[PDB]
Amino acid sequence: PVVIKTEGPAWTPLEPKLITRLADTVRTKGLRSPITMAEVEALMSSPLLPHDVTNLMRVILGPAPYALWMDAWGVQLQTVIAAATRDPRHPANGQGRGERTNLNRLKGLADGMVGNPQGQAALLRPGELVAITASALQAFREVARLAEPAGPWADIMQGPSESFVDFANRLIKAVEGSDLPPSARAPVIIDCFRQKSQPDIQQLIRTAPSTLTTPGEIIKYVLDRQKTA
Amino acid sequence: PVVIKTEGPAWTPLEPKLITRLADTVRTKGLRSPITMAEVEALMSSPLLPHDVTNLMRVILGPAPYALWMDAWGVQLQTVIAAATRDPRHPANGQGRGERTNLNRLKGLADGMVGNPQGQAALLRPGELVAITASALQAFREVARLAEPAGPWADIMQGPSESFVDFANRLIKAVEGSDLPPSARAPVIIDCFRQKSQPDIQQLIRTAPSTLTTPGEIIKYVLDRQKTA
Amino acid sequence: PVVIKTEGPAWTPLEPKLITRLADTVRTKGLRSPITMAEVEALMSSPLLPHDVTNLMRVILGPAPYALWMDAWGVQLQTVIAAATRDPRHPANGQGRGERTNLNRLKGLADGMVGNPQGQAALLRPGELVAITASALQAFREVARLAEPAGPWADIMQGPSESFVDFANRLIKAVEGSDLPPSARAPVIIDCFRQKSQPDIQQLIRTAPSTLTTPGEIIKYVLDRQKTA
Amino acid sequence: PVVIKTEGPAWTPLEPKLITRLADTVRTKGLRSPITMAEVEALMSSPLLPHDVTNLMRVILGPAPYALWMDAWGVQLQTVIAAATRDPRHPANGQGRGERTNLNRLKGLADGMVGNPQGQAALLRPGELVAITASALQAFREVARLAEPAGPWADIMQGPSESFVDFANRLIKAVEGSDLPPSARAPVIIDCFRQKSQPDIQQLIRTAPSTLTTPGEIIKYVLDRQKTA
């Protein structure tokens, strides 16, 4: 993090207490939990310098996820630089050709920046910072989606002893965290409620005097009329 | 069937040979096979009188499907009569109120028609005949879809000894003959190819150097690179 | 949360630290514990924008409870809008017909609000905010009461090894969290103390020289004269 | 099928009796038998409209072979359209640029053709029809060769109880329906007769006072001098 003061942009590091809490969050909840992504968005609020994001991912991520994240961050930054050479009005670019932003300046590899966060904060633009930050966030999302797969939705059955809300949670999780289009999730969730969800609940849904046309309505109906046991 | 000659509309019955062949087709292939529906469409080519369709369904259908079909035919004819009272320009209706078509005239129950196909062919309109015929076809479709369910798609697995084309046929049949929207069948078929289809073919599809984005392409790829055994 | 400043209503997000603590509270204590409802009331203190409440319930609730909560919130907001069209003096409404509040404006679906919390905070009324907040709280209460049933009170027995205060806690919980009228809980709790609560305590309550006419008095008496073991 | 009459090209459907017989032929004999290909050539005699061929393949082929056939038909039609843009003298094309034939017109997807066979027969050219028909025939051949592989020729042995004419039939089938060049089939068939075909017939062929230089001559010799049993 940088503070743009009168003397110039002064760099302030992130608290190691927040970083330790975020690292333990990633350690217990995993990379893909919505609470973890919310915490990352929180610590991704102010535009960070390449040094900050690099050290942050070095600390919170293990070695192999860190390698994957470096790869993904490079790819996303390259897409950004292609869009930048496709539009001279990038908030990282300038009007003349002398302000064109090279990947050495984005990854912090340019002259006067390697290993020095103060000089980094000096030469970098705010548009550069926000582009780097958005790129790093998208790369984190990619790596998180890659490190742990969503479980195959079509293999999910309600166990003989499992409750129905746990089964519904697991199924909705695996269906929404999958490769289906957004407009195909609700019908699939409904038809999986009807064919999975062991034959007692199957018959309970089948003999519904009303027509249930939404996963929430099916869940409410089943929770009302379920066999207390 | 009727022939509209100079003396007047003369009724000609359908051949009992064609009816016997159609009955045996329904007996061996079932009610829902595409060949059976094609044969029914064939014998549903000329506009039939209520007597013809009623006797045809009496002969080709069993007792319980015949009861179901009578119910469905009545419901569809009632929808037709509601649309007819909602539009005085029905090809079964006339311009004045004296030509309004009652359900007794559609079901063949009106005066001068009960049990007599000749009088039926005399008083009926061609628009009446085509409306009755379309109603009977839709009712047959409903009863055929009702008598035998499509198998639940989410419970289909490729057996240890089953070939892949049989599994693909069964899966595509159960997915297309189900309650899914038309725009959700291809993604579901693909994701069921990937998660069902026992782990040898699962790994064969997983390690595809190209991206397969269509059930036909997946089928072609698997048929090319399958383990001959 | 919004701050109504001189430039205009500026939106401030809730702390992810408080949200993480509340999510872990819901994870360990459940949805129905009085501590959880107190914490929700705490984080429901300032009038929240639809964006805030929606994201809050997305984070703290699982997928299936979140679907149930969306349903219940919609129903409660519809009741609010019916009361609003039944009274033109709603703090969300205005005096003329041009200020009537549609459900698109309450759920945050209206024009200039979809996905943008700043514009949301701009166009929304404080009465709108408090109505949305009360609706969301009532919906949370409904879903919490629905997700986990109170245990059937008439099936509660004091175990052979269970202490009496645990049995009394369980019984009072199940009786007060049930479908009985408020004026029928004390007599039922007393008569369940007398007939459940294995025969040693049954005889201890039976041979009470004084008449015990309150669950608290029965609990005090039994705790005084109980067989220390 | 279309009849080009004085009023204009009138469409006549194929008989459902012939289609049912062809479907049962495909069901019993398979896709690759020479009798099946002859029957398809028979029903592929008059130039068919895209509607006719599409419905024909929908009826005679299962779901997965139908998907494969749609793919192959599209590819072959694309090759045809490439040849058409490579030669302005295509019987489907015209002399000016306004008669160039797009794939929407070949697949029946163009304007005034979607779902309507009468309009289809109206706007289509006879060269268009014959090109579509030849493309569909080649696609059927590809899919038939793909759905069922020829058995590996180099793994064919004459069983201990199998007769010699059955072994010769199986071997010639697998060798001619394989990936060998046409000029390499006879020597391979001969050398497989000599090394397979269990040692009694091996010695019978070895001790041939004449030199046998053709599979037919070897078959005749073995049938003459075989051990009757």
Residue numbers in the entry:
A (entry chain A), B (entry chain A), C (entry chain A), D (entry chain A): 1 to 229
Question: How is this structure described in the published paper?
Answer:
As the virus buds from the cell, the viral protease cleaves Gag into several fragments, including the capsid protein (CA) that then assembles into the mature capsid shell (core), rendering the virus particle infectious. The CA portion of all retroviral Gag proteins folds into two separate domains, the N-terminal domain (CANTD) and C-terminal domain (CACTD). In mature lattices, CANTD interactions form only intra-hexamer and intra-pentamer interfaces, while CACTD interactions are also involved in formation of inter-hexamer and inter-pentamer interfaces. Our results show that, like lentiviruses, RSV is sensitive to IP6 in vitro and in cells, where in the mature CA lattice IP6 binds in a pore formed in the center of the CANTD hexamer.
High concentrations of NaPO4 are known to induce RSV CA to assemble predominantly into T = 1 icosahedral CLPs, which consist of only 12 pentamers. The observation that within pleomorphic polyhedrons the CA pentamer constitutes the rigid building block prompted us to investigate if the pentamers within T = 1 icosahedrons and polyhedrons are structurally identical. Hence, we acquired cryo-EM micrographs of T = 1 icosahedral CLPs and subjected them to single-particle analysis, yielding a 3.1 Å resolution reconstruction. At this resolution refinement of RSV CA into the EM density was unambiguously possible. We compared the model of T = 1 pentamers with the model of the pentamer derived from the polyhedrons. In fact, the two models are virtually superimposable, showing an RMSD of their C-alpha atoms of 0.74 Å. This finding further underscores the observations that the RSV CA pentamer (1) is very rigid due to the tighter packing of the CA domains in the pentamer, (2) always promotes the same local geometry, and (3) is independent in arrangement of the size and shape of the CLP. In contrast, the increased flexibility of the RSV hexamer allows a more random distribution of pentamers in mature RSV cores. This enables RSV CA to even form inter-pentameric contacts, which can be regularly observed on polyhedrons and in particular T = 1 icosahedral particles.
